[PDB]
Amino acid sequence: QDLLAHCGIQLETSLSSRLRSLLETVRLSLQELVSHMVVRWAQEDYVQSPELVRAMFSLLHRQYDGLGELLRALPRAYTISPSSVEDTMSLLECLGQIRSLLIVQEENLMIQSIGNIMNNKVFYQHPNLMRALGMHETVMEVMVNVLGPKMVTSCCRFLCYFCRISRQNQRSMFDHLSYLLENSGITPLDVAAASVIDNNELALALQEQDLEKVVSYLAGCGLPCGGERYLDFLRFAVFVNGESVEENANVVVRLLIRKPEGLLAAIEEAIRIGHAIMSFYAALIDLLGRCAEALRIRAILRSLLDDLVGIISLPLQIFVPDHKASMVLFLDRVYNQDFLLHVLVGFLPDMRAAASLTEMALALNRYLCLAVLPLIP
Amino acid sequence: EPTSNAQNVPPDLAICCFTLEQSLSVRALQEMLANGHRTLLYGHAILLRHAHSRMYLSCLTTSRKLAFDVGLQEDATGEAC
Amino acid sequence: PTHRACNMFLESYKAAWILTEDHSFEDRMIDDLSKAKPDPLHQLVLHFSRTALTEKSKLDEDYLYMAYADIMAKSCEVSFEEKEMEKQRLLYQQSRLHTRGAAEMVLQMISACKGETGAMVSSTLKLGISILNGGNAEVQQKMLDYLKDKKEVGFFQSIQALMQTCSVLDLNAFERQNKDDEFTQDLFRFLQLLCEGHNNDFQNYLRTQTGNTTTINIIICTVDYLLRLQESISDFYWYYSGKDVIEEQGKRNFSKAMSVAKQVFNSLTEYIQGP
Amino acid sequence: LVYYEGGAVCTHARSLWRLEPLRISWSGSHLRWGQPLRIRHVTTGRYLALTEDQGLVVVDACKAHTKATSFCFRVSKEKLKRDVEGMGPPEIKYGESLCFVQHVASGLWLTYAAVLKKKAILHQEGHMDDALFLTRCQQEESQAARMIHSTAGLYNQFIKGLDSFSGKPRLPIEAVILSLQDLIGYFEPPSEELQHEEKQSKLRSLRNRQSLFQEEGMLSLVLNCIDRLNVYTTYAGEEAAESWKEIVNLLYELLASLIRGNRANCALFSTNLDWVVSKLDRLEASSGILEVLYCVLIESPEVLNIIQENHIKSIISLLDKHGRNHKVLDVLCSLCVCNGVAVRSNQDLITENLLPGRELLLQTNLINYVTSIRPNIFVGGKWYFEVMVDEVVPFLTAQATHLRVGWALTEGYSPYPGGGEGWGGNGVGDDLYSYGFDGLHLWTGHVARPVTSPGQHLLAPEDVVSCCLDLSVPSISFRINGCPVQGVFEAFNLDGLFFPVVSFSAGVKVRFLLGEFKFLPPPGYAPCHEAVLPRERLRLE
Amino acid sequence: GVQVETISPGDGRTFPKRGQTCVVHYTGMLEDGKKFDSSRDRNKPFKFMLGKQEVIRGWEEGVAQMSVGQRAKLTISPDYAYGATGHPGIIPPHATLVFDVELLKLE
Amino acid sequence: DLAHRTWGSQNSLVEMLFLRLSLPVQFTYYYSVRVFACVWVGWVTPDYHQHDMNFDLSVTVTMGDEQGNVHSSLKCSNYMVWGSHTDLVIGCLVGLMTFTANGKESNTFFQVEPNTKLFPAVFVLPTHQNVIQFEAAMFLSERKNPAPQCPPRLEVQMLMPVSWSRMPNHFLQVETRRAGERLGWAVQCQDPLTMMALHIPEENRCMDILELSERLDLQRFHSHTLRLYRAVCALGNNRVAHALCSHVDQAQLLHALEDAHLPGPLRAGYYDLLISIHLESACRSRRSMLSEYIVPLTPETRAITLFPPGLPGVGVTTSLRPPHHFSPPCFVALSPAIPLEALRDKALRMLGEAVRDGGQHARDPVGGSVEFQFVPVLKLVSTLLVMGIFGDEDVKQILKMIEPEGLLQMKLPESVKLQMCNLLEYFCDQELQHRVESLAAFAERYVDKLQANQRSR
Structure with a gap:
């Protein structure tokens, strides 16, 4: 692409002269009549319809603006392969169907239209067209227009998948994170999460204020179901692509230690019983496991080995695999061979692995991919 | 609006006030009526704009005893103000 | 392919020969x-x-x-x-x-x-x-x-x-950029222009805004902006105290804050320029 | 109760205080430190005061005696002239002055006890932030506020009186009406005939005012006045209630007045809408309530989802109640659209409860002209005539081309070529007695009663209508080509002179058979050509 | 039930059959005689497959009596029309229709 | 209000009163007529144009059995009648009317209707003061829509219309070509014309809209009804639009686009209806899509040359922007259909038949103002051209109409040049269209040449 731009750097290969002829043709009798007649209407009367003025000077603007109008025009413009054009005809028409719905039974029409957009071949192939339509902004705008039900979730599915299709397109979703988090009173958070995942760039670019809003939502969890969600979004935040980014993680920890908001005994009681609580402590210890002058936060995590016993109680709780998985991830990133012998409980789970002839089929997988950690009487 | 009981039951002073928008000699008034902080002088007529509603004080026509009732007409026009 | 190069061409061309x-x-x-x-x-x-x-x-x-x-x-x-x-x-x-x-x-x-x-x-x-x-x-x-x-x-x-609002040099964001001045500068250039030419009544108008219901000293605001920019400079210097050699991104985004502080001390200078 | 409070509360009228020094004179002297004074809330009118019963409390003026209520400012927290008749030295700026507040008796400083509802309390030390700095209110808000005070007290005594004569059938009146009028004038919208800048300024002030009365609950108060006044359709004496119409009408006018500007003010009718529609059909104030409902919808997009089928049914029923009013319709237009966004359910429901009935608003469709031409002759024995048809083309344009042919008396029947009765047409008058066209049969009173005939064929460019009429005897019957079409018309007026008509529309060519018959049975009986006798020659007109 | 009534005769032979694309003009009014419809107001022919049940059942049964070129009134029963529902925004619930159908031609 | 009304005759004259009330009934309900001072109480069919004393009172109908006999008797309505202190003449109904003079059941009079409207009425020759008074469920429970509602609620619409003998009406424009040959007296006529007509259902009587202009209250109401109809179809509300097609018709809108005798606000009304009930949802769907500027690489799009071997009216079109489909209105069983190709011709024909004579400086002025003469039409043409409707040769007709290269040179009212600025804005938007497209085409060709270059490396 950049090499093609170098091909475009011909202004300072004989084709460049033909390009020069192009630009000279791009320099340009409707102009003289529009401009001067708008000048007539302006001179002659002192107009006093403000809409008329807005239009007159809109045109009077764009007539003189003969180079910049094409400039604002091009990003909306996009070229398409002749073979696949029909799908676009099945697209924009359906997209029109959401545009109408932007300005309001209808929800079935919305879900159907968005689903038809989901099924189009001209979607994976041309992400630049899709961003150029502005349609993601449209969808999110409709979602906000509703908020203040199922179709919202459909919009969430669309936004998430739209985040999944490509990263440069993911930036556009990235632009609205604070806004969507303002919209997240309660899945939209899955959308913001998908907006954060793949890009480390985006993962760093995010302002701390968003995370402040998120931990504030954590502070709203004084009694919960949403906490596992928020913690999940924090997880996709800080943990990005395996590496633990220092910048996000540090801030997230400094925020979490302020509004948190004996707890191990509550965990043990959760084991004896409501699954959202155990999932909360799991996602929390997991989030702590995704993070690691910078050394002090490690110690702050050391304050929370308080663990180990959670892994053992879980091994005696068979639900289990994810909670204990988080306890092991945290145990590894935060916290020698002798202690590893002390941990060995896991051999029992290996004995239980043959019971697949269920949930334990998931557990054997989760712990065989977590069997790597021990590698490191 | 009684004020001698200044202790236990204070007067509603918010609307006891009357700003002096203008003051003129009797003959002097008749010009502007037919058509700055100067000090008041006795024998002069004075306008009495209220400090709140800002309706000029004036004698009225309505009776409540032939005596006319006192009021606050909206505008300065007329001899009454 | 066909269309791909056409899109990349129009996109590159938009940032190339359109300016001019x-x-x-x-x-x-x-x-x-x-x-x-x-x-x-x-x-x-x-x-x-x-x-x-x-x-x-x-x-x-x-x-x-x-x-x-x-x-x-x-x-x-x-x-x-x-x-x-x-x-x-x-x-x-x-x-x-x-x-x-x-x-x-x-x-x-x-x-x-x-x-x-x-x-x-x-x-x-x-x-x-x-x-x-x-x-x-x-x-x-x-x-x-x-x-x-x-x-x-x-x-x-x-x-x-x-x-x-405005903008400050900031610290952590730079660390995020290691791995918006022009508006502030235009703002203080604006106020500086409102005072330049030594209009005493207008400068005193900035001091208090006489007749309006909410008086608002704006020189104290300009000063406060200079102060948080100041703390931002100090912070930036302590961040570079040990590295000796400066990154070019740390130069451009410090010449930035020096440009701002130049326009803002100058905006104070035209606030107090007359006697 | 007294609260420190941030955010959106600074603009509230209840967040105001009036400093009222003890001296009857020179109240406007500059605020020197340490001079005793009585603070007063502006809206309630109650003075702020210390009291043994409940500590720091706002309370009525009769209760707030000097030392219990008085306050004095200090530069700090130190406890260290008489009362000059002059203005005194200049002192406290609203900007550059962090003034501490102190009680005069107990000496307690004004601090706060510890959602943003931070209650204030007196205490001998307190937090290091007791030095509230004073900030001047705009004179307009102050005027508005004392206006709230007088308004509140007036409507309160009024409502207490309404309760005084409410449930036990056998007190301010004119003060109240004048109150409402001066209030309506105080909230009269700026005229459209004014330059833009001053208009927007006055409008912004109108927003602040309509807001300020809403924030003191004055809207809710007038709403309670209206609520308690809807009970009677007329107790009170024949004088106090004699002016009830004016009162209640001015109430809805004032009530409309508060909502015409702000969006929020009609957003607080979110729960009141069912009431507005319930009172919509009082048929007493009527237009006031209608303007209220109109003013609400135009600026409350939030208050469009709320509406149900009952409300629209009562609005269109209202249109039924009050003849025709475009005002009712603009309301319905406001129901159709918010600020711009559509409301499909509501549109559908206006549609379903209004349009399909077709028996309310004006209804329209293009109509081909109706026309008929008499063959001169006036006719009072029995008489008879034929009417051959030669050209028709029934379904040209739109309407079927009527060829109704029959009798009508001169003293009535005035076929002005549209409009008139039910979509125009022959047979609209009882004086008329036509036949042919749709199903043959009759048209009297613009009614198509289907008399049967052996064939039932419509007139075609071959048919010959065979009309009959009798003197004295009121019998009337027509035929198709000599085929009987049963006994039809009987017993009618015999005044004036009936004449043959032959109605037609669009492209039609038909021959009269008067004399020249292509066909003529002796039933009846007398040929029409004979009736051309008098002196005027036969000549269709 | 449905109460079709002939207005004017057509060819009188070629009755409609299943699956045929009937071509007609018609115009619809209520029992009050208030109009609600007219194909001539569109100035275009109305085609419809017969027995497709794309139309109200009274239309499906009543046209079958009609011959080509025939004009016929149709006093369709509501249950064969829209019945308790009523076609929204046009026909009120439980309202007998009145048509002035003209069967141009079978196809 | 027990629901009644006092009256009097304070005048030297006491000729005639026809108190025909404005609330007709269709098919218990008492209707008392109190009288302190004979009186002709009766229900009346809406059609009654007879101003005279000559009662009584101006109709039997019979059906044969292919031989005569019975199965005949019908109605006689026209309609109802009557004849030293108070009097009471109730007229209860529902079916079959019944009379009860002085509260006593002396009926057995006329009472046979199938399902026809009836104004309550009282015909009276005055005996001066307190002449008349009015009122088993109440009549009010019946007349108004919210039936039953037994308690009586007096209505504002309960008016008391006197049958004034001579109310003025429209003189009609061009009408029937009358003819009548003396050869057997064969009367003949040819070319048809149509009224822009409407009735008033609440008290049925026909009248054309052309007459309606003088009844400015009524054009107010009616233009606002049109505001309602325009309103309801806001943005893609086709579900109702199929109903409004029933309510206002297609050809009726065409005739609304024809006649210039139509009053202004109504004219803009119907012209806005054409851009609502029909051509409004589609253009709205081709606004943003027109602005998308996305383009196929098909050979027709491959030209484009920008400069012709310029002109806004060039026929290259290209791009995508999906077609605006229409499902035609029908009632037998969500985008209403129109004769578009005819309507564009009608639109341009309305353009010429306005720009021409308006350029001749006439003061009819069509709509009663120039604003009405142009705004609705320039609006219709605007949207219609935005929809991509019009062949470009007709667009050339628009440009020779405007540039010329007539209209835009003329002095104009503000709204007219507003709408004009919108249409011209569409032209400039077409200019940007052609430019972006030509650029994309050259992008295609130059990508071909350059990719051809790429394999040389």
């Missing part, structure tokens, strides 16, 4: 708007002005206003005589505007924006600076006269909120 500069048009256009009960340009400024006077609370982006406020902004011993000749040309190009009330559309539009910091306010301030630039006196006279005529009071509220 047809922009030379902006004067001619405006010259066409001042050619004989109000002139067309006056129609324009009165329209945007009334547009700002409306209780929109939150202003819409108004691409029109953007366009034209950008337009007017772009409207502005032999070397000595040519120098004050250009001064007269400039003062003429300002006369083309403020006599048509542009100073008022500027100032109302800034007051309208409140604490919002969209493209809007930035274009307005650039328009203000283009109407002034030279330390123009009549414009300052219309301006101050306007604010003492219509006690809109919210103008200062707006700029106060702007400087409560």
